[PDB]
């Protein structure tokens, strides 16, 4: 359902530094969350589980690329640090919360690099 549009376009010139931040739905239990780069396959960047903690996708030092933070009304922020953006970092980024009782909630960012 997300491969129709849904997401937000994000333009950048090479060299740019950009933070993407995603936010949990109110009044849900946070079950797990993750960041992915979406091509033909969904390639996970980092995953956070509220008990097991951080887990990275393939060789990463991803603890320097993501951060989770709680705020006021149980809402959680989930952010991805993009640094020194090349055309290779361009593409579709997907933040996927799995919540209870509402299930999956996803936010798509299209990073466009000139």
């Amino acid at each position, epitope marked *: 359902e997300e491969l129709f549009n849904v997401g937000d376009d994000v333009y950048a010139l090479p060299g740019s530094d950009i933070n993407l931040t995603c936010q949990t739905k109110e009044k849900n239990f946070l079950v797990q969350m993750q960041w992915s780069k979406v091509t033909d396959k969904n390639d996970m960047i980092a995953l*956070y589980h*509220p*008990q097991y*903690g*951080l887990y990275c996708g393939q060789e*990463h*030092a991803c603890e320097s690329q993501v951060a*989770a933070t709680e705020t006021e009304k149980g809402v959680t922020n989930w952010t991805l640090y993009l640094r020194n953006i090349s055309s290779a970092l361009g593409g579709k980024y997907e933040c996927i919360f799995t919540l209870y009782p509402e299930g999956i909630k996803t936010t798509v960012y299209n990073l466009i690099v000139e």
Partner: antibody
Amino acid sequence: QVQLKESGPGLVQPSQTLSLTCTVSGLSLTNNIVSWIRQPPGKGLEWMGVIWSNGGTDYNSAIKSRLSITRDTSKSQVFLKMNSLQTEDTAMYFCASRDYPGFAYWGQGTLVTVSS
Amino acid sequence: ELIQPPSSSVTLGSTVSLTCVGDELPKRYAYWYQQKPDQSIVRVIYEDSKRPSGISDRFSGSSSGTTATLTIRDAQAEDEADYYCLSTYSDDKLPIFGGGTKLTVLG
């Protein structure tokens, strides 16, 4: 770069309690776990216990009765406290973290000698 | 619980496979650690067969049923170490280490 550094007294007397501290840098302690692993001299690694990303804990059932793990998120430190020590507790003590259960980062370890 | 042979040999340039056998390994991933004499610990294989950045491509891994194996190719002297496998046990999914295999490189 992340670094885990264990610190401790080096020498503790039998029937005293052993207080170790793991200082985490480059990892957000509130988003990560920290395990304590021990290695008696010449022996293999034995997992001792974990404080989960949410402040809960679990321990190896063979030492659970004397073991206690806590944390101070603001100081970014995790504490191991183990009471009523015998000579067999003489070991190298490591903390490790992230990619549970396949801990990706390890401290160097501190040696603890239990002796009168 | 996690069964590893306490020692093994290879001669320079040849291949060893080190094994780790456990009941739940068909349902749990295995991780492999190399511990050098100064006692520092390095993760060389994760999730049965994935290799982390910065580890020599002579290291690889594979799993079938209840034995996970770690495979060192073109053995170098600096592969002399203790290798430990790590996995998860019981309903509470807690970690366990095998007993460790001491690997000596001959020649």
